[PDB]
Amino acid sequence: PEIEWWDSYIIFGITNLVEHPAQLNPPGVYLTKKEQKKLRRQTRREAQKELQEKVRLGLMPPPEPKVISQGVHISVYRVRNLSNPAKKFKIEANAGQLYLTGVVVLHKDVNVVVVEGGPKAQKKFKRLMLHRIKWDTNKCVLVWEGTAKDRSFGEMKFKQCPTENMAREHFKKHGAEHYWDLALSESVLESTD
Amino acid sequence: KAEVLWLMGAKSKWLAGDVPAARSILALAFQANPNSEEIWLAAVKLESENDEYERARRLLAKARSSAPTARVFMKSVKLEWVQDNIRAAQDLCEEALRHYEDFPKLWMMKGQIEEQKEMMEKAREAYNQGLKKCPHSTPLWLLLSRLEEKIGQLTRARAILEKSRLKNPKNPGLWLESVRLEYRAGLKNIANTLMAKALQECPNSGILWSEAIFLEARPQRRTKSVDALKKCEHDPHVLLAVAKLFWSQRKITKAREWFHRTVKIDSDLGDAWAFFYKFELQHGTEEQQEEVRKRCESAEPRHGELWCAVSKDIANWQKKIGDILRLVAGRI
Amino acid sequence: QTWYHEGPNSLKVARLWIANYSLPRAMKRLEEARLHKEIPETTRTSQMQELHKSLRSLNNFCSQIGDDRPISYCHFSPNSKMLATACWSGLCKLWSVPDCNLLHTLRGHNTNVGAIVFHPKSTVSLDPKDVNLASCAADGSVKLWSLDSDEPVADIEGHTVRVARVMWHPSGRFLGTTCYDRSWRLWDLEAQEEILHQEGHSMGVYDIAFHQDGSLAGTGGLDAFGRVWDLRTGRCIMFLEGHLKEIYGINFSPNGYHIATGSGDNTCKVWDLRQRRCVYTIPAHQNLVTGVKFEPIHGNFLLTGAYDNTAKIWTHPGWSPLKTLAGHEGKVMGLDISSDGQLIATCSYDRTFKLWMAE
Amino acid sequence: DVNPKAYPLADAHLTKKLLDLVQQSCNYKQLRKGANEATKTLNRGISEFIVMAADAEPLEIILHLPLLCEDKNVPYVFVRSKQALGRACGVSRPVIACSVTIKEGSQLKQQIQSIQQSIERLLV
Description:
It is classed as splicing. This is part of a larger assembly, with chains A (193 residues), B (332 residues), C (359 residues) and D (124 residues). Chain C is mainly beta and 359 residues long. Chain C is 13% helix and 44% strand. The relative contact order of chain D is 0.26. Chain D is an alpha+beta fold and 124 residues long. Classes of the chains: A alpha+beta (193), B mainly alpha (332), C mainly beta (359), D alpha+beta (124).
C-alpha cells in the first residue's frame, strides 16, 4: 500500500468545527411480622364481614351448627478423552435440561465442550463437569469463561472430527474458531511438558 | 516378609541397656542381611554410639561395601565435611548428583557446604538447579530465600518467595517465611496483611496462628489466643504460644500448667522442652529444672523451628541431647 | 444527527499543525514497512522464532512494595531507566530501573490517582525542572510535574468529575484527557489552554490512545463502544463495536494496521483499521481485561492483564498463548513495556509491582 | 450524585441482589449490623463481605471500613440508601454498615461467593 484511506481523504476538509455524530445507545420491600399479621387479620375480618352481610340479605342460608437477552454467558472446557457413552449422555442431558446451547467436538486427546446460556445454568453445569463426574490422567479443565452479545449455536450436538482442520472450519462456520484455537494451543503446550 | 519384628527387637534391646546383645544381634543381621539397608544404618548408629567415632567410620566403610542407596553418599560427604577439606565432600556430592538428582537433600547439603566455603553464588546456583529439578521442596525454597535475603536485595527474596508460594501452593511454611521476611524489614503492616491472607487460606495451621498471636499488640493478644484455641485445639504450637503468653504476664502457675499440657500432648517437639526448661530455671526450684531435664532426656524430640537450627549446623551435629537443649535455651 | 458546532480558530491552527507534523511521519512509516517486508523469508522466520523463545523464557524479579495502598498505574520513562507508579493514596512515586530505588516521591493529589505518564522526551531532550510528567486523580483534577520539585506545577481546572486517563500526544505538544461527562478533551501545552472538547460517547469515557504518527486518536468508553477520531478534522472515521461490556483498554500498534481493545467480557478484540472490521477475538483471561499494550517499535507481540492474578503475552499476528506471567496475589491494575522491549512492569492491587525480564 | 467518596457504588440490579442476600443472611444468623460490629468482625477475621450506605450524613464515620477491608482482604460495596439497608437487615432504624459472616457448611456459600466475585469487579 501507498496511502491509508484517511490520509488519502485529507489530501483539505479542515475547519474549526466540532462533531457530535450519530448517538448510539449500548446493546421491592419486605413486610415485617407485625405488618404481615395486620394484613392477614384485616383480610380475614373483611371476608367474615362480607359473608355475614351476604347471609343477612338472603343470598345464602344461615350456617348450621358444627357437630440470556442482553448478554449470554459462555464457557469452554476441554477433556482428554470423552468416548464413554454414559458421560456423553450425561453432558447432553444436563445441557439440554439447563437450556445450555453449544457443542461438543471430539478429537485425539482434545475434546472441546462449548456451553452458552445464563449464569445459574452455567454454574450448575460447571459444578457437574468439575466435581460430579469422576474421570478416573483423564482430566477436565476450564479453558475459558466469559460473555458474548448473543448465542452462536442452536443446541448441543456431538460432532465428530479426526482432523484438526475439520474441527477448526466447523467452529469457523458459526464464527467461533478462537475457542478451538485457544484450546488446541493450550493442548500443545500441555503436551510439551 | 518384613524386618518390623527385627526393628522392634532391636529397640527393645536398646531400651534394656544390653549393649553387647544388641550389638551382636545387629552385626549378625547385617552379615546375614535378612532385611533392607536399615542394617547398615543401625550398624553406623551403634558404631557412633560404640567406643569411638572410628567405629562409626568403620561402619560407614562396611555400608559402602554393602552399597546402600545414594544416601550412603550423603552420609560419606557429611562425614568428610565434619573434619576435612571441602574437596572430598564436594567430590562425594558430585558423584551422588551424577548418580541421582532427587532426593533434594543432596542439593541442600551441597549448597550448605558451598556457603560454608568461600563464596555463595555457587550455592545459589546449586539451590536453583535443585529447585528446578525437584521441584516441590519447601526446604530448598527456604534455603534459597534465606541465602538471597542474607546477601541483600530484599526484592529478589520477595520475588523468590512469591514464586515458591505460587508453585506449591497453599502451604503454611512458605506463608510464614514470607510473613517473617516482611517483618524483619521495617514493614509491619505488610506482614500483618500477609498474615491475614495466610490465615484466610490456611485456617487450621498451628504455626501460622502461633505467629499471629504475637504479631498483635499487648491488649489484643487474649482474643487472638482464644480464636487460635477454638480453630486448632490440641495443637502443640498453639498450646506453647498460650504458655508463653501466660509466662509473659507473670501468671507463672498457669504457664507451668500449660507447659505440662504441651509436653504431654506432643513430646517430639524440641522447642517446647527448651521453653519449659528456661521457664523453670527463671521460675521454680532446681529440682524442677532437673525433672524437666530428665523428662526431655527420656523422649528425644525433633522437628523444631530453632531446635533443628542447631541439630543441623555441622559444628554440633554429633553432640547429644542435653547440650543441644542447653544451646537452644541459651539463644533466646 | 451529526450536528456540528464552530469552535475557536486556535483549534484550526492546531489541527493544521497536527496534519503537517503527522503526514511525513506516516509516509516514512509506510516506506520503512515496505523496505523491511521484502527481506528473505528464512531470516524473518528465524528471528521471530528466537523472539518467541525469549518471550517464553521470561522470569519475574524486583517485586517491590510500592506503597501501603493499591498501585493503580505504572509507566516507563523514555530510555527505560525510571518507572513512575501511581497509588490509590494521593502519592506518586518514581523508581530507578532495574534496582527499583525510590526517587523524589511526588505529592499534591488528595484522592485516588489514576494514570501517570512521562513526557515523550522526558529523559532525552527535556531539562528536569520543566514539565515532565502528567497525572490525574479520582476527582476532577490534573497536575503536571517536574523531576526535581516533589510538588506540582500549573494544573488544569477544566474537569469537575472523575478523570479516567491521561495521555501525551506523540509530538508532546498536546495532552489528552477522558472525563466522566461522556467526553474527552485535548489540552495544548504551548498555548496552555483546552482547545478541543469532544463529546461522542453515550456514557463516561475511560481509556484513550494516540496513534504513533500523531494522526488518529482511539477512545474507549464505558458504553462498550469505541471511537477512532481523526485529530486533523475530528470526524470520527471508524465506529467499532462488538463488545457488550465496558471497554477499559485501547492501544494502537506501531504499524498503522491494528488496534487492540479490552473489555469487561473477558475478551481482547483485535481490529484492523485498513478494513474497518474486527479481525480477531482472543479469549484472554477469566476476568475483565484492564489493559492491552502492543509491543514497542517493532510491535511483534501483545501484552494483556486482567482482574485475575495473571498477565499474558500473545503472538501477533497469530495470537497464540506465548506466555503467562503469574505471581501476583491480587488484581493486575496496570502494566507497561520498556521502550527497548527487554523489560516488562506490572503493578497490582496487592500493593506491589514486579519486573519481568528475559533470563 | 450520591457522593464521590463512596467509590464502589452498586447499581439497582446488584443492589437488589445484595439486599436479598442480606435478608437471607439475617434469616440464617450470619449477619452483623452496625459499623462497630462490622469492625469487630473484620478484626476477628470472620467477615465474608461488608455493605455500607452511601448517604451517611458526615460519611467519614464509615470510611475506615474500606481501609480495614483492604488490610484484611475483604470485598466491600456501597448502597445508596441506609433506610433500605436497615429494612433488609431486619430493623426499622437506618443502618449504615453491615457484615456477612462465615458459617461452616451453610447453604448460602454459593450466593456469597457469586456476590463476592460481582463486587470485586466494581473497583475499576
